[PDB]
Structures are given as C-alpha cells and as structure tokens.
Amino acid sequence: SMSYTWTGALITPCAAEESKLPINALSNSLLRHHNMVYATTSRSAGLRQKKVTFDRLQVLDDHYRDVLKEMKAKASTVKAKLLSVEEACKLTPPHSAKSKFGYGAKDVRNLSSKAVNHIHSVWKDLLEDTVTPIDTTIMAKNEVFCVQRKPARLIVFPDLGVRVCEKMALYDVVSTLPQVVMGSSYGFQYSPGQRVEFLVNTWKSKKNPMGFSYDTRCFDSTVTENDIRVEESIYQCCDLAPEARQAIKSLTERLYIGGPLTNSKGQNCGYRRCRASGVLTTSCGNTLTCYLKASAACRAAKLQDCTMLVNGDDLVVICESAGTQEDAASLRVFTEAMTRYSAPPGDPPQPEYDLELITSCSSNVSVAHDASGKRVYYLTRDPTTPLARAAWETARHTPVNSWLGNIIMYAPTLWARMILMTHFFSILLAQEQLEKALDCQIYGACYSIEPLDLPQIIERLHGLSAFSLHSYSPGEINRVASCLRKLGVPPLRVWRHRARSVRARLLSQGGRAATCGKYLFNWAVKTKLKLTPIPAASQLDLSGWFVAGYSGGDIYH
Numbered sequence: 001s002m003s004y005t006w007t008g009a010l011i012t013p014c015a016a017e018e019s020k021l022p023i024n025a026l027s028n029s030l031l032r033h034h035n036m037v038y039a040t041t042s043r044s045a046g047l048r049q050k051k052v053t054f055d056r057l058q059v060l061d062d063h064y065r066d067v068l069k070e071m072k073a074k075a076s077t078v079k080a081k082l083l084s085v086e087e088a089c090k091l092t093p094p095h096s097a098k099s100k101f102g103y104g105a106k107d108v109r110n111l112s113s114k115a116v117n118h119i120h121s122v123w124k125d126l127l128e129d130t131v132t133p134i135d136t137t138i139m140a141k142n143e144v145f146c147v148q149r150k151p152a153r154l155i156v157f158p159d160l161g162v163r164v165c166e167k168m169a170l171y172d173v174v175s176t177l178p179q180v181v182m183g184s185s186y187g188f189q190y191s192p193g194q195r196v197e198f199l200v201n202t203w204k205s206k207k208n209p210m211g212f213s214y215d216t217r218c219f220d221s222t223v224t225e226n227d228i229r230v231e232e233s234i235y236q237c238c239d240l241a242p243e244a245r246q247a248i249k250s251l252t253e254r255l256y257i258g259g260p261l262t263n264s265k266g267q268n269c270g271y272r273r274c275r276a277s278g279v280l281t282t283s284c285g286n287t288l289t290c291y292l293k294a295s296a297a298c299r300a301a302k303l304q305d306c307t308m309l310v311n312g313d314d315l316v317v318i319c320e321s322a323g324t325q326e327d328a329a330s331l332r333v334f335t336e337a338m339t340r341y342s343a344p345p346g347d348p349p350q351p352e353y354d355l356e357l358i359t360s361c362s363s364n365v366s367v368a369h370d371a372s373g374k375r376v377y378y379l380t381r382d383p384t385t386p387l388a389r390a391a392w393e394t395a396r397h398t399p400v401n402s403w404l405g406n407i408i409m410y411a412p413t414l415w416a417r418m419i420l421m422t423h424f425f426s427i428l429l430a431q432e433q434l435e436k437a438l439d440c441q442i443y444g445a446c447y448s449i450e451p452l453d454l455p456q457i458i459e460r461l462h463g464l465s466a467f468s469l470h471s472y473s474p475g476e477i478n479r480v481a482s483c484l485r486k487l488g489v490p491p492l493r494v495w496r497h498r499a500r501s502v503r504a505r506l507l508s509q510g511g512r513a514a515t516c517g518k519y520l521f522n523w524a525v526k527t528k529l530k531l532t533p534i535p536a537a538s539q540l541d542l543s544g545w546f547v548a549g550y551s552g553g554d555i556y557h
C-alpha cells in the first residue's frame with residue numbers, strides 16, 4: 001500500500017517560522033558564517049511528502065517467522081502494569097501540544113478535572129470502539145542544520161487526551177519489553193560509557209571483525225500495516241490487565257496502523273498507512289521491527305555470528321569477516337533481504353574493518369588518553385550540527401536545549417569541552433542563571449536538568465577520565481578543525497583562553513559553581529587540580545535515564 005495519500009491541502013505552521021539564524025551580541029563569539037545555518041519550516045514539507053510517499057511490498061520468509069517466534073517467547077515473560085490517569089498525566093511534558101478539547105499540558109500536569117474527565121472518556125471510548133480511526137495532526141518539524149538543504153521532517157501525533165491514554169496502556173510495556181526481547185542488542189539501555197564499552201567488547205569478541213551501519217530510507221514510511229500488527233502481537237504476549245489488552249488492540253487498529261491526517265488549521269491532508277512519528281510506541285515499534293528484520297536478514301545472508309545494536313530505526317551490525325569479496329557480497333544479500341522485508345537502504349551499507357570508521361547513532365568510536373596515560377575509548381560525532389544548533393540557541397530560547405543534551409552525551413569530546421562548555425557557562429555566568437533548571441531531551445524523553453549538576457552527571461555517564469582526557473586522535477582533530485573553518489568558529493586556542501576566564505569566575509563563586517570550574521575546566525589550565533570522585537555523584541537519582549527510547553512519545557521524566 002501507499003505510505004501516504006494526499007488531498008493536496010498544505011501542511012501548515014502554528015506560529016511564524018524562522019529559517020534564518022537569529023543573531024544577537026553573542027553570535028559572532030561562537031560562529032561567523034551565519035548564512036551556513038538554517039532551520040527547516042513547513043514551507044519545504046511538500047518536498048518531504050514527495051520523498052516519504054511510496055508503495056511498500058513485503059515478502060516474508062521462514063527466517064522472519066523464526067525470529068518473530070523467538071521474540072514472542074521472550075515477550076511472554078513480561079508482566080506489565082496499567083498506569084493510573086494521575087501517573088500518566090505526570091509523564092506529560094509542560095510544553096506538550098494542547099488538546100482540541102479545551103485544556104492543555106499544564107491542566108494535565110496539575111490534574112484539572114476538565115483534563116482528567118476528558119482523558120477518562122477517551123479511555124472508555126477506546127474500550128468500547130476498536131475500529132473508528134482516531135484523528136491525527138501532521139506538522140512540519142523546525143530543525144537546525146548547516147548547509148551541505150534538507151526539507152522539514154514531518155510529525156504525526158494524536159490529541160493530548162489520547163496520548164495520556166497511550167501512557168496508561170503502554171508506558172510500562174515500551175519501557176520494559178524491548179530489553180527483555182532484545183537483551184544486549186537494545187541500544188537505549190546504555191549510558192554513552194556503556195554503549196562504547198559494548199561496542200568495543202563486541203568488536204574484540206570477533207576473531208576478524210567487520211561492522212557496518214544500515215541506513216533505511218525513511219524508516220517510518222517503510223513500516224507497513226503487517227509490521228504494526230506484528231508489533232501488537234508482541235505486546236499482547238505480555239501479562240497485561242484485560243483493560244490494557246483491549247486498549248492496546250484498539251490503539252493499534254484505530255491509530256498505530258493508520259488514520260486520517262489533519263493540518264493545524266483543521267483541514268484534511270490525507271491518509272497514513274505507516275508509522276506515525278509522534279506516538280508513544282514509535283521508538284519501541286521501530287526497534288522491534290528493525291531488530292526483527294535485521295536478525296532475519298542476517299540469517300538469510302548467512303552473516304557469521306552477527307551482533308546487532310539497535311536504537312529505533314538505527315542499526316549497526318558487527319560480525320566475523322569472510323574477507324572483503326564475501327563481506328561485500330553478504331551485505332548485498334543482507335540488503336536484498338531487508339528490502340524484501342520492506343526496509344530498503346538510503347545509502348547502501350559498506351563493510352568496515354576499523355571500529356572508528358563506523359557511524360551509529362550519528363556517532364563513531366574514537367580514542368583518547370586519561371591522566372595516567374591509559375588509552376580510553378569514547379563516543380563522538382562531527383560537531384557541525386551540534387554547533388549550528390548551539391548557534392541558534394545562543395540567540396533564541398528553545399523548548400529543548402540541544403546544547404545541554406550534547407554536553408551530557410558528548411562530555412569526553414574535544415568540541416563539547418572546549419567550545420560548548422566554555423560558551424554556555426559564560427552565558428549562564430553573565431545572566432546569573434547557573435541555578436536555573438533547563439529542559440533537554442535524552443533518548444527522546446524530556447528532562448529538567450540543573451547546569452550545576454553537570455559534573456556529577458558527566459562522572460556517572462562517562463567516568464572521571466572525561467574530565468582528564470588528552471592527546472586526541474588526528475582524525476578527530478582534523479574533523480573538528482575543518483568544522484570550525486567551515487563555520488567560522490574561533491580556533492581552539494581562543495576557547496582555551498576564554499575557558500581560563502570562565503573557570504576562574506566559577507571557582508570565585510564557591511559551592512557547586514566552584515565544582516563545575518574544577519571538573520569541567522581542568523583542561524584549560526597548565527597546573528592541574530586533583531580530580532577525585534564527586535561526593536554528590538553517588539547520591540544522584542539517575543534511574544530512568546537509560547531504560548528506554550521515547551522519540552516522539554511525549555515523555556517527561
């Protein structure tokens with residue numbers, strides 16, 4: 001079937017959309033080549049619609065059913081609970097889109113009776129009716145990039161009332177099921193420090209390692225009715241309350257499988273027969289479907305001892321090599337199999353024989369040295385998009401502070417420490433806003449974080465070495481330097497100078513500000529301080545950080 005059918009009506013914005021990088025007094029201190037950075041808008045959505053609209057064919061074999069049988073067997077060991085309305089309301093982000101039915105996210109969060117009553121009636125209706133398609137809104141995402149332009153990504157989501165019901169029915173399932181079914185292969189269970197450890201151990205477990213990432217062309221669009229019905233059959237394997245069972249089937253038939261699309265102005269835009277990016281089960285569904293299809297494709301292509309690492313639609317596979325001729329021919333069969341399962345690639349996969357050349361979750365393995373001269377593996381990426389977005393957020397306040405999520409997940413890196421840490425701590429200092437909790441997304445869920453808790457956070461997710469890493473690789477150094485040149489970002493020597501200043505100001509203030517200055521900026525000074533375990537690091541409640549992915553699932557933690 002066609003992933004989408006269109007009425008010809010336009011995908012529309014809510015407010016005005018900026019595509020040009022906004023510029024304030026602070027912009028040039030980060031980035032000179034302003035015209036390199038742009039944000040997507042609804043006005044390029046027609047180009048995206050084109051791309052994501054295709055027929056899907058699916059041919060399912062015995063390897064496919066075998067793996068599926070395996071997944072169901074493990075899924076049947078899961079016992080999952082129904083969440084109360086109240087519990088589910090509290091999982092709702094403050095900034096979440098308001099209901100068409102006269103209440104918003106904060107009404108939900110403070111449990112107003114208009115919110116609670118409508119939610120109760122959406123749930124009742126789910127139990128009563130398993131056939132009537134639920135309405136969704138299609139919006140264009142506004143995202144920031146550096147020019148190479150990408151058209152806007154689309155987001156399809158149901159009304160807030162329905163989203164709270166999804167939580168009630170499926171939050172425990174999507175939080176717990178994926179690790180049980182997929183074990184060590186489930187990407188979203190890992191801190192960055194654990195993920196790199198898993199990658200290295202896995203590489204090191206192979207006699208002759210070969211790895212490749214697999215980029216599916218528009219994963220959501222490739223997801224068929226069958227796939228969505230298959231993922232539901234996996235949810236129903238769990239020990240569920242009968243109201244959860246009924247709710248899950250109903251959300252599946254009425255929402256997940258497909259339904260009508262409406263713009264922000266209330267016009268009918270068409271119909272969807274593929275994955276919605278803005279539902280609770282988007283991340284879990286993609287991961288189950290990706291791992292199912294990949295595992296089955298691995299058996300068809302006869303890949304030796306293939307180890308999967310899956311994060312929603314993101315797939316890296318590490319296996320035994322059979323030499324370059326055979327590896328290359330194997331990956332073609334792997335791709336043919338995936339293609340038959342309706343997950344063809346955008347870029348064709350290539351085998352890699354160096355772990356550091358594999359990009360997965362937009363990230364590659366790299367190596368640095370700690371205090372004791374010990375080699376240390378850490379995860380990194382091309383700093384171009386992180387810096388473009390940092391540049392946007394330097395002049396515009398945003399719902400998600402990507403800069404902050406990046407500092408958390410890329411703490412050990414050269415660019416995050418020298419540029420991102422320096423720039424943003426300087427800004428918090430000037431505004432006396434160090435104490436101010438900021439929102440950011442990690443693995444799709446929204447977190448309220450205090451910038452001053454960063455030292456503890458970094459210690460827990462990466463280890464202390466993150467505060468002591470030096471002697472980065474020429475590869476990493478070259479990519480960073482060429483990013484700064486391309487973007488017009490001051491050289492790293494400037495950032496070192498600025499940091500000594502930022503550091504001194506932090507230390508001057510004592511308390512947690514001083515802690516940040518000591519741990520985050522030890523690299524800036526020649527005469528280093530001694531970095532011991534942070535007392536507060538062990539006290540931090542970081543449970544719920546690396547349990548699951550929730551991309552598009554409206555989760556606040």
Ligand SMILES: CC(C)(C)CCN1C(=O)C(C2=Nc3ccc(NS(C)(=O)=O)cc3S(=O)(=O)N2)=C(O)[C@@H]2CCCN21
Binds near residue numbers: 313379410
């Ligand atoms: C350093 C690390 C450990 C390699 C992580 C890098 N990395 C992320 O991979 C990430 C992330 N990964 C995803 C991958 C694939 C999908 N596909 S889907 C739509 O669910 O089907 C979704 C998501 S996400 O939205 O849950 N967010 C983060 O949220 C964090 C935060 C800054 C960047 N960082």
